[PDB]
């Protein structure tokens, strides 16, 4: 919508959001992996 | 410390998290059985009171009943 062509639009999209998606995924993965350190089996079996 | 501040703080945070994990993880359980205390008395025989029964008479023999 800004005006770039499809090639430049694709490269701009990747440059601007590649790291953010990875960081969000890593936060979600790491947070859930903290359930592995609990004591109740119901919580612990959800981490991995 | 432009290139030193980050790893040091990361290590500090990791150590704090590990400490918290170690402290709280062991609190669960830790009370499976209850054992009552024992307080007995010394069972000894010092200065025991002595009770003596005596039966005597002009007869030859007798029939005797008593409480121990």
């Amino acid at each position: 919508r800004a005006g770039e062509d499809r090639e430049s639009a694709y490269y701009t999209m990747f440059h601007g959001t590649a790291h953010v998606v990875l960081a969000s995924g890593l936060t979600i993965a790491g947070a859930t992996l903290c359930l592995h350190f609990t004591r109740l089996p119901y919580f612990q079996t959800m981490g991995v | 410390l432009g290139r030193i501040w980050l790893p040091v703080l990361i290590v500090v945070a990791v150590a704090a998290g590990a400490l918290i994990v170690m402290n709280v993880r062991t609190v669960f359980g830790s009370n499976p059985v209850v054992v009552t205390e024992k307080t007995s008395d010394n069972a000894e025989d010092f200065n025991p009171k002595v009770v003596t029964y005596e039966i005597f008479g002009s007869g030859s023999s007798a029939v005797i009943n008593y409480m121990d």
Side-chain angles (χ1 to χ4, degrees), chain A, chain B residues 1-36 38-43 45-68:
Chain A
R1 185 182 298 111
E4 305 188 21
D5 57 330
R6 301 182 174 187
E7 196 88 8
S8 300
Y10 158 90
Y11 281 93
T12 299
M13 164 203 74
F14 195 93
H15 178 32
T17 52
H19 57 285
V20 174
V21 171
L22 178 69
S24 165
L26 285 190
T27 52
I28 299 180
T32 60
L33 198 57
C34 297
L35 291 167
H36 186 72
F37 301 140
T38 61
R39 294 305 302 268
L40 301 189
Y42 273 173
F43 300 146
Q44 176 171 3
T45 54
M46 300 176 60
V48 181
Chain B
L1 35 75
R3 306 294 168 80
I4 317 174
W5 70 276
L6 196 54
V8 170
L9 222 165
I10 289 179
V11 170
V12 166
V14 165
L19 176 60
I20 297 183
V21 162
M22 295 305 177
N23 295 331
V24 187
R25 190 175 170 91
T26 58
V27 194
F28 173 72
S30 72
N31 201 107
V33 201
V34 168
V35 179
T36 62
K38 180 173 180 296
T39 57
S40 296
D41 55 350
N42 175 248
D45 297 327
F46 186 75
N47 266 133
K49 57 168 51 179
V50 168
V51 182
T52 306
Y53 293 133
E54 290 176 4
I55 307 288
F56 53 89
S58 67
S60 54
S61 59
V63 178
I64 305 172
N65 296 349
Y66 63 94
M67 298 285 293
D68 59 359

